[PDB]
Structure formats: structure tokens, C-alpha cells
Amino acid sequence: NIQGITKPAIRRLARRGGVKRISGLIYEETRGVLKVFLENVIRDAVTYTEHAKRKTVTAMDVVYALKRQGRTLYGFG
Amino acid sequence: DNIQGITKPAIRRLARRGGVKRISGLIYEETRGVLKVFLENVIRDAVTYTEHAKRKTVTAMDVVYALKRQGRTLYGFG
Amino acid sequence: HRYRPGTVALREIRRYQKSTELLIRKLPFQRLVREIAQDFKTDLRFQSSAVMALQEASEAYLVALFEDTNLCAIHAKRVTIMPKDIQLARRIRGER
Amino acid sequence: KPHRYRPGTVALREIRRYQKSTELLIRKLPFQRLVREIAQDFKTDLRFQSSAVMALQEASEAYLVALFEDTNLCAIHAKRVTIMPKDIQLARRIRGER
Amino acid sequence: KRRKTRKESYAIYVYKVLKQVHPDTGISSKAMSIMNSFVNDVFERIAGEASRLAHYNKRSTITSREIQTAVRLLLPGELAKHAVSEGTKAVTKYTSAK
Amino acid sequence: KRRKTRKESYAIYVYKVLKQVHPDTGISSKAMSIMNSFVNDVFERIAGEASRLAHYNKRSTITSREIQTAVRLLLPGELAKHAVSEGTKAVTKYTSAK
Amino acid sequence: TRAKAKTRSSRAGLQFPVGRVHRLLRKGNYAERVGAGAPVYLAAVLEYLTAEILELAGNAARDNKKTRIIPRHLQLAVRNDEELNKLLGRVTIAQGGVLPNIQSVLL
Amino acid sequence: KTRSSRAGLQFPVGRVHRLLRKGNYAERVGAGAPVYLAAVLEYLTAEILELAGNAARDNKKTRIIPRHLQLAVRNDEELNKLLGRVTIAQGGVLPNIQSVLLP
Numbered sequence: 001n002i003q004g005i006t007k008p009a010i011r012r013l014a015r016r017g018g019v020k021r022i023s024g025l026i027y028e029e030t031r032g033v034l035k036v037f038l039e040n041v042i043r044d045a046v047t048y049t050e051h052a053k054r055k056t057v058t059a060m061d062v063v064y065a066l067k068r069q070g071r072t073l074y075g076f077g
Numbered sequence: 078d079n080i081q082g083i084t085k086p087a088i089r090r091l092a093r094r095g096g097v098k099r100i101s102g103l104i105y106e107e108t109r110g111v112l113k114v115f116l117e118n119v120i121r122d123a124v125t126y127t128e129h130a131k132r133k134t135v136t137a138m139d140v141v142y143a144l145k146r147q148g149r150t151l152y153g154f155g
Numbered sequence: 156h157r158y159r160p161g162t163v164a165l166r167e168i169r170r171y172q173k174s175t176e177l178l179i180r181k182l183p184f185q186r187l188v189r190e191i192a193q194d195f196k197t198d199l200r201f202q203s204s205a206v207m208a209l210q211e212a213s214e215a216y217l218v219a220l221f222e223d224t225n226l227c228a229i230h231a232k233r234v235t236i237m238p239k240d241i242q243l244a245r246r247i248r249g250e251r
Numbered sequence: 252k253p254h255r256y257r258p259g260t261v262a263l264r265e266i267r268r269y270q271k272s273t274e275l276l277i278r279k280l281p282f283q284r285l286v287r288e289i290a291q292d293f294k295t296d297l298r299f300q301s302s303a304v305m306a307l308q309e310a311s312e313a314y315l316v317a318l319f320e321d322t323n324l325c326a327i328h329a330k331r332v333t334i335m336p337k338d339i340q341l342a343r344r345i346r347g348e349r
Numbered sequence: 350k351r352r353k354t355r356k357e358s359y360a361i362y363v364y365k366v367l368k369q370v371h372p373d374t375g376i377s378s379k380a381m382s383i384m385n386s387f388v389n390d391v392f393e394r395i396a397g398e399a400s401r402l403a404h405y406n407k408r409s410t411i412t413s414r415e416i417q418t419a420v421r422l423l424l425p426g427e428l429a430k431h432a433v434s435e436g437t438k439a440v441t442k443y444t445s446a447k
Numbered sequence: 448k449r450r451k452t453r454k455e456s457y458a459i460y461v462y463k464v465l466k467q468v469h470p471d472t473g474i475s476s477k478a479m480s481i482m483n484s485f486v487n488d489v490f491e492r493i494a495g496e497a498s499r500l501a502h503y504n505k506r507s508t509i510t511s512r513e514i515q516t517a518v519r520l521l522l523p524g525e526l527a528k529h530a531v532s533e534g535t536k537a538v539t540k541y542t543s544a545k
Numbered sequence: 546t547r548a549k550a551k552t553r554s555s556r557a558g559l560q561f562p563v564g565r566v567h568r569l570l571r572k573g574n575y576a577e578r579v580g581a582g583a584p585v586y587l588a589a590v591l592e593y594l595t596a597e598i599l600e601l602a603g604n605a606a607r608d609n610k611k612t613r614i615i616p617r618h619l620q621l622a623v624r625n626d627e628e629l630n631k632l633l634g635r636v637t638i639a640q641g642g643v644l645p646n647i648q649s650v651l652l
Numbered sequence: 653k654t655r656s657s658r659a660g661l662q663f664p665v666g667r668v669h670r671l672l673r674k675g676n677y678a679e680r681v682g683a684g685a686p687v688y689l690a691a692v693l694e695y696l697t698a699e700i701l702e703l704a705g706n707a708a709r710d711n712k713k714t715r716i717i718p719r720h721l722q723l724a725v726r727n728d729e730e731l732n733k734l735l736g737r738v739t740i741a742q743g744g745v746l747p748n749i750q751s752v753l754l755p
Contacts, residue, residue, distance in 0.1 A: 001190045004183025012178040013214060014236065016171040016643055017221030019228075020164045020651040021235040029238040030217065033245070037216055038191050041209065044520060046195040051516040052504055057192070059204035064503060066212050066637075068496075068520065074386040075379055075616065075639030076208040079288045082281025090276040091312065092334065094269040094745055095319030097326075098262045098753040099333040107336040108315065111343070115314055116289050119307065122422060124293040129418040130406055135290065137302035142405060144310055144739075146398075146422065150488060152481040153718060153741030154306045161651075168647055175617050175642035208639070215637040223345050229650055230341050231329050243328050247321050247345040249736065259755065266749055273719050273744035306741070313739045320745075327752055347634065357565070365560045366595045367614070371603035375613035380602070383619055383638055387598070388591055390636070392569070395587060400575040400676060411575060413582035420590050425628040428597070432590045439589035440582045443557040455667070463662045464697050465716075469705035473715040478704070481721055481740055485700070486693055488738070490671070493689060498574060498677040509672065510682035514689050522692075526699070526730045530692040537691035538684040541659040574676050 002031050041065050080109050119143050177210055184210050220244060275308055282308050318342060359388045395419045413440050457486045493517045511538050554588065561588040561595075601626055616640040656690065663690040663697075700724055700731065718742040 010030050014022055042057075044065035049057050059076045066073045088108045092100050120135075122143035127135050137154045144151045171178065185206050192199050221236070223244035228236045245251045269276065283304050290297045321342035322334045329338070343349050363384045367376055376384070398419035399411045408415075413436075420432050461482045465474055474482075496517035497509045506513075515534065519527050553563035567584035570576075601622030602614045609618065620641025623629045655665035669686035672678075703724030704716045711720065722743025725731045 001183065001186040004187055005179060006183075009179045012167075012171055013217045014221045014225075015164070015167045016178060016214075017218045017225060018168055018172070018647055018651070019221050019225045019236050020161060020168065023235055023237045025238050026236055026241070029241050033220065033241065034213060034217060035187075035191070038188065038209065038213060041212065042188065042192050043195055045205070046192060046199065047516060047519055048500075048503070049199075050196065051500055051512070055198065056200040056202060057205050058202050059208050060503070062205045062208045062212075064499075066208075070635050071212060071216070071637065072390060072635060073208060073212050073637045073639065074383040074390075075211075076204055077382070077386070079281065079285040082285055083277060084281075087277045088315075090265075090269055091315045092319045092323075093262070093265040094276060095316045095323060096266055096270070096749055096753070097319055097323045097334050098259060098266065101333055101335045103336050104334055104339070107339050111318065111339065112311060112315060113285075113289070116286065116307070116311060117292075119310065120286065120290050121293055123303070124290060124297065125418060125421055126402075126405070127297075128294060129402060129414070133296065134298040134300060135303050136300050137306050138405070140303050140306045140310070142401075144306075148737050149310060149314070150738045151306055151310055151741060152484040152488075152738060153309075153477055154302055155480070155484065165647070165651070168651075169645070172643055172645045172647075175620075175640050211639045212637060218643060225648065226341060226344060227325075227328065229648060230325065230337070234651060239328070243324065244345055246324060247342055249346075263749070263753070263755070266753075267747065270745055270747045270749075273722075273742050309741045310739060316745055323750065327750060332753060359561070362561045362592070363595055363599070366592060367599045367603070369560070370596050370600040373612065374603045374606060376599075377613055377615050379616050379640060380614045380619055383616055384595065384598070387633075387636075388595060391591060391594060392566070392587065395590065396570060396573055396575050399583070403576050404676070409576060410578035410580055411570065411583050412580035413586045416583050416586045416590070420586075423632075425631040428594070428628045428632065432593050435593040436586040436589040439557045439559055440585050443553065443563075443582070443585045446556040457663070460663045460694075461697055461701070464694060465701045465705070467662070468698050468702045471714065472705040472708055475715050475717050477718050477742060478716045478721055481718055482697065482700070485735075485738075486697060489693060489696060490668070490689065493692065494672060494675055494677050497685075501678050502574070507678060508680040508682055509678040509685050511684035511688045514685050514692070518688075518692055521734075522696075523730045523733045526696070526734065530695050533695045534688035534691040537659040537661055538687050541655070541665075541684065541687045544658040574678055576676055 002035055005031055005034065040069065044068055080113055083109055083112060118147065122146055177214055179210060179214060181206075181210070184213070223248070275312055277308060277312060279304075279308070282311070321346070358385050360385060363388070394423055398422055456483045458483060461486070492521055496520055553585065557585045557589065559585070559588050559592055561592045563588050566591075597626075598622060598629065601629070617642050620644075655687070659687045659691065661687070661690050661694055663694045665690045668693075699728075703728055703731070719744055 007027055010027050011022060014026070041062065045057050045061040048061040048064055063073055063076050085105050088105050089100060119140065123135050123139040126139040126142055141151055141154050188201065188206055188209055220241065224236045224240045227240035227243050228234065231240070242251065286304055286307055287299065318339065319334070322338045325338040325341050326332065326334045340349065360381050363381060364376065367374065395416060399415040402415050402418055403409065403411055417433055417436060420436065421429050424432055458479050461479060462474065465472060493514060497513040500513045500516055501507070501509055511534070515531060518530050518534065522530055554561065557563055563584045566588045567579060570579045570584060598619065599614070602618040605618040605621040606612065606614050611618070616638055617640065620638045621644065623633050623638065624644050656663060659665060665686045668690050669681060672681045672686060672689070700721065701716070704720040707720040707723045708714065708716050713720070718740055719742070722740045723746070725735050725740065726746055
């Protein structure tokens with residue numbers, strides 16, 4: 001499912017970041033970086049959910065996971 | 078004018094410990110400015126901690142707390 | 156009619172810096188999140204807001220990383236981002 | 252003809268020596284004077300414990316060494332072996348200090 | 350007919366402040382949620398800084414001066430001094446009233 | 448004349464652990480201070496994470512489960528699982544004795 | 546008889562709830578005791594920060610010909626102000642976008 | 653009989669319990685929480701001390717110095733990740749020279 005992040009999506013993300021020209025090897029590296037970041041955040045969120053004895057990962061769990069990694073996110077509680 | 082006390086050999090030694098093999102001549106002023114900014118931040122936090130404690134002596138614990146507040150935890154001073 | 160190689164890139168940069176909507180498709184990202192979470196716990200359920208927050212955080216992180224990568228590429232007298240630029244940005248950040 | 256090492260052998264020797272050693276690399280008295288001069292702008296008639304100055308010097312040297320490692324990495328990225336102020340600026344910008 | 354539980358938020362106070370600073374200006378639900386999260390985050394930051402300030406000085410009470418020191422530590426410069434001025438003015442007015 | 452006020456540190460426990468792991472290796476004063484500061488920092492990290500966990504779940508007590516979740520969230524990889532196993536073993540033995 | 550009830554926020558001249566802040570401080574596991582003036586001071590600081598951000602966001606919204614603050618206006622207000630940007634440097638605002646910034650070398 | 657002896661631990665369970673109670677962390681502290689925290693602290697201390705002793709023996713020293721602790725922390729991947737933003741006084745840096753700079 002990592003291939004679901006298509007080349008145009010990565011290009012759009014780079015354009016929002018001000019990138020004008022993109023090498024062909026950027027896409028695999030970006031997919032790997034995104035996978036690592038999501039793995040860390042999701043692992044923390046699942047740990048929070050398991051501590052709560054819940055079976056549904058809530059937005060608050062993701063917010064706490066992000067805040068633990070110094071990535072506080074507003075707009076979700 | 079104590080920023081000049083951080084001499085060129087000192088900056089060169091710090092770069093050598095950092096693994097730098099060749100140093101430009103304009104590196105020293107930039108390094109002195111960066112060090113001044115960092116020391117200003119840490120000393121400001123330390124003086125804030127000391128003033129809150131109603132003390133006139135800046136202690137090692139104040140410096141440790143200031144470094145911890147800035148995400149630069151220091152071990153070996155309490 | 157053909158625009159020169161870089162006019163459309165600048166146009167897209169302006170368009171996507173003006174805009175604020177998410178740039179990754181919702182369903183593929185949700186599927187990736189579920190696949191990643193499968194390795195941590197089975198039969199997991201996700202709230203829609205949780206997946207939206209994950210998507211927002213991931214896109215913000217990727218945009219910041221691409222900004223740093225563009226800065227690295229410019230530092231090397233280039234206008235094209237390369238994987239070594241991303242690696243350098245992540246190494247300076249303190250992630251690898 | 253007097254003996255002369257080529258330009259870069261002595262630099263590598265210094266790198267090895269200062270990476271093997273652990274003592275502070277900045278002179279103690281100038282650093283203490285700089286700390287006192289900076290602290291004068293925040294509160295007058297401040298006193299400093301010796302351990303406070305030692306901790307400040309340790310933290311400053313560690314920060315400078317890490318910054319110089321990042322600067323060396325940035326300079327190597329630019330296909331150079333010489334660190335320049337632009338490398339330091341790039342490192343501090345990527346770190347998020349500028 | 351199960352009434353939802355009471356969820357407290359700073360929405361009404363943020364709306365009052367917005368009407369004070371911009372009478373003919375509204376705020377969306379997402380922006381209100383963002384402002385509420387900002388208020389909560391700043392509250393947590395200042396309260397934690399005051400708590401560790403009290404613990405460092407071996408005190409059991411969080412007072413006005415602990416919060417003032419926390420504000421001075423956490424806010425960047427002019428924001429810090431204006432926040433301190435507003436806080437001192439509010440505390441003086443509250444003490445003067447009753 | 449008067450003995451200095453006692454300051455509690457983890458020196459003797461670290462020394463016992465060192466003698467368990469290295470019967471013939473000693474430790475310097477600076478290394479002992481560093482170990483004590485490391486223990487204090489890890490204790491603060493785990494306790495703060497457990498407190499936040501209890502607050503998030505509207506709980507008033509910090510138990511073994513909350514500390515265990517804090518350990519899993521703070522320690523990376525094999526460190527977390529080994530610490531979990533050691534702690535569960537200690538808790539099981541403690542409840543088995545009295 | 547009992548006197549008429551007056552809110553502590555009214556005494557302090559503040560819009561933020563002094564009583565709610567005091568209750569949160571007492572039940573937040575911060576300290577064993579909470580002073581009378583700490584909630585007043587913290588409510589004042591929170592109100593000032595909210596006023597600053599809301600004023601800048603209203604300016605941004607008026608610039609964008611809007612009469613309603615959206616997350617984009619909040620992001621623009623925060624990132625265009627140096628001190629607010631430093632305060633929220635590690636904070637991501639949902640649906641906030643990014644500031645227009647194109648490097649000169651790419652032009 | 654000390655609570656540390658019951659759990660088979662060398663770290664003070666009672667002192668950890670008192671610090672948890674007087675640390676403003678929660679209204680109440682469980683009985684097994686100090687045991688678990690003492691066990692975790694003892695395990696981490698044992699790991700770092702074992703690695704530092706190995707480094708000291710590799711440096712022909714019998715006493716652990718800050719250099720040994722720094723080497724032990726930065727040579728272990730997980731310990732380096734745990735103490736990534738931690739500075740050890742008088743610890744120095746690792747002998748790392750970039751391959752491009754070698755002759």
C-alpha cells in the first residue's frame with residue numbers, strides 16, 4: 001500500500017515545499033521516510049490505545065503520539 | 078570585547094574535534110557569533126532561574142535547568 | 156504551444172502554496188495506515204479524525220522535509236533535489 | 252631542506268588527537284570573562300559558581316563540536332573539503348535555529 | 350434521547366476576545382478548535398514550568414511569581430514582557446477589588 | 448563543626464549494580480555523578496509519561512501498568528522489551544513474597 | 546443574607562475564566578497548593594496571547610477579503626510574526642498550508 | 653525487610669515510592685509501580701555499566717571515567733537513541749573521520 005502514494009502526490013508535496021525539479025529516485029526515498037514516520041507515530045498511538053483498553057484508535061491517541069515526538073498538532077482536540 | 082577571547086586556535090581545535098580538515102578564514106567570526114547567541118540564551122535562562130530563587134549567585138543547577146529547558150540536558154553537574 | 160521546462164513547476168509551486176487542502180489521496184493513505192498498524196495490533200479500528208490527523212501530520216512533515224531538501228540542493232549549486240539531499244537533511248535534523 | 256609535512260597530514264593528526272582526548276579546548280579564563288560580560292546585560296553584580304562556568308563551557312564546547320560536524324557534512328555535500336560560513340548557516344537553518 | 354456529556358472548552362472566551370479585537374469578524378469551527386488547542390497547550394506549558402520551578406526551590410505552592418517566571422522563560426521577548434505587564438495589571442486589579 | 452545536610456543520591460545502588468556486572472571494575476566520582484543524573488532523568492521521564500497516561504485516562508493512581516506503558520513509549524526496541532520483562536519479573540516476585 | 550456573586554474574572558477585568566483555570570491547576574497534579582493570584586495571572590497571559598493571535602488572524606482574513614477566520618489565516622498570522630513563529634515553531638496547524646516562499650535561484 | 657529485597661532488586665523501592673508520592677505525578681501511587689520502576693532503572697544502569705566496564709577494560713583501565721560512559725552510550729544504538737539529546741561532561745566524541753578527508 002506504500003505504492004498508493006503516487007508520483008504526482010509526492011510531486012505535489014514537493015511543490016508545496018518549493019521544490020522546482022525532482023529526481024526520479026526521490027520517490028522511493030520519500031516513501032521510505034513516510035513509512036518510517038508513520039510507523040513511529042502509529043506505534044505510539046497503538047500503545048496509547050492499548051493502555052486505554054480500547055480497540056479503536058482515536059484522534060486523541062494520534063495527537064498524544066505526535067506531541068510525544070515534539071510534533072504537536074492543533075485542530076483535533 | 079571578551080568574544081575575541083575565543084581565539085582562532087580554540088575554534089580550530091573545536092573544528093578538529095568535530096572532524097573538520099580545512100577551515101575558511103571567515104569561519105571564526107561566524108562561530109563567535111553563534112557561540113555568543115547560544116551563551117546569551119543559556120545565560121538568560123540561568124539568570125531567570127537565579128532571580129526567581131532570590132539569589133545573587135548563578136549556580137550549576139541553574140545552568141543545568143536552563144540547558145534541560147532548551148533540550149540540551151547535561152550530565153555530571155547534579 | 157509548449158511552456159519552457161520550469162514555468163509549470165513555478166506555477167504549481169505558487170498554486171500549492173496558495174492552497175491548503177491535502178495533497179495525498181485519502182483512501183491510499185488510510186490503507187497504508189491500516190497496513191502499518193496491522194504489524195502492531197490485529198483487528199484494529201480507526202476513527203476518521205485519527206486518519207485525518209495522521210494525514211495532516213505526515214503531509215506537514217513531508218513538506219518541511221522537502222523544504223530542507225530544496226535548501227540542501229541549492230547549497231550544492233543545483234536546482235534538482237536528490238536522495239542524498241534528503242539524507243543530508245535528515246542527518247542534520249537528527250533522524251538517521 | 253627542512254622537513255615539511257604536506258598540507259593536510261597535520262590537520263588529520265590534529266583531528267585524531269582532539270577526537271581521542273576529552274579535555275576542554277577553550278581557555279578557561281577568557282570563557283569565564285565572556286560569560287560574565289554576557290551576564291552583565293541581564294543582571295548587575297552577578298556572581299558565578301565555578302561549577303556553573305564549567306558546565307557552561309562543557310555545553311558550549313559540545314554544541315560547537317556538533318555544529319562543526321554538521322558544517323563538515325554540509326561542506327562535503329557541496330563537494331568541498333573546506334568549511335565556510337554558508338555551511339554553518341545551512342546547518343543552523345536545517346536544525347531550526349535561524 | 351441521551352444528552353451528550355459536557356465537554357468544556359475555551360470557545361466562548363476566545364469568541365469574546367475576538368469580538369473585542371475584531372467586532373465584525375467571525376471564526377470557523379476548525380479555527381476555534383485550533384485556538385482551543387493553543388490555549389490548552391500554552392496552559393500546560395506554563396503550568397509545568399511553574400511546577401518544576403516550585404519543585405526546584407522546594408516550594409509546595411504555585412504563586413503569581415512562579416507563573417511570571419514561567420512566562421518569562423517560555424515566551425520570546427516582547428511577548429514575554431507584554432504578557433508579564435498584562436498579568437501584573439490583572440493581579441493588581443484583582444487584589445484591589447477584593 | 449556541623450555536618451552538612453544529607454543529600455540523597457543513587458551512588459550505593461549504582462555501585463552494587465556495577466559490582467554485580469563487573470566485580471573488579473570501579474567508578475570515578477564524575478562517572479558516578481553522571482550515572483546519578485542519568486537515573487534521575489530516566490525516573491523523571493518515566494514518571495511524567497505515567498502521569499500523562501493517568502491524566503489522559505481520567506485515572507487518579509499510577510500503577511504498574513501505567514509505568515509499563517511509559518517504559519514502552521520511552522525506551523527504544525530491545526531496551527523496552529527487556530525492561531518490561533525485568534519489571535514484570537520483579538513485580539511478580541514482590542507480589543509472590545508479600 | 547449572602548452577597549451577590551461576582552466572578553473572579555470580573556474582578557480581574559479578564560475574559561478568560563479564572564475559576565476554571567484555578568480548578569485545572571488544582572486538579573492538574575502540578576503542586577500541592579495553588580495561590581490565589583496564579584489563576585488570575587495565567588488567565589491574563591492566555592487572554593493576551595489569544596488577543597494577539599486573533600488580531601493578526603483578523604488582519605490576515607481582512608487581507609483575504611474574508612469576514613471569518615479559517616485555519617489558513619491562523620497559520621499566516623503565526624508564521625508572519627517572528628515571536629509567534631518561535632513560540633509555535635514545533636506546532637503544526639491543521640489545514641493551515643504554508644507561506645508563499647520561492648527561492649530566488651529557482652526564479 | 654526492605655521492599656527491594658522482596659522484589660530481588662538493588663535499587664531502593666521505598667525511595668522511588670516516596671519520590672513518586674512527593675513528585676506531584678498523581679493523587680495516588682500503586683504498590684507495584686515503584687517495584688517496576690526500580691527494576692527498569694536497575695536494568696538500564698546495569699546495561700550502561702556493563703558497556704562502560706567493557707570500554708574501560710578495552711582502555712586498560714579499572715575505573716570507569718566519563719569517557720567510558722560516553723563511548724558506551726554512543727556505541728550502543730538504542731542507548732544512543734535514548735540519550736540522543738544528552739551531553740555527558742568530559743565525554744568527548746567518537747573517533748570519526750570522513751572517508752573523503754582521508755589521504
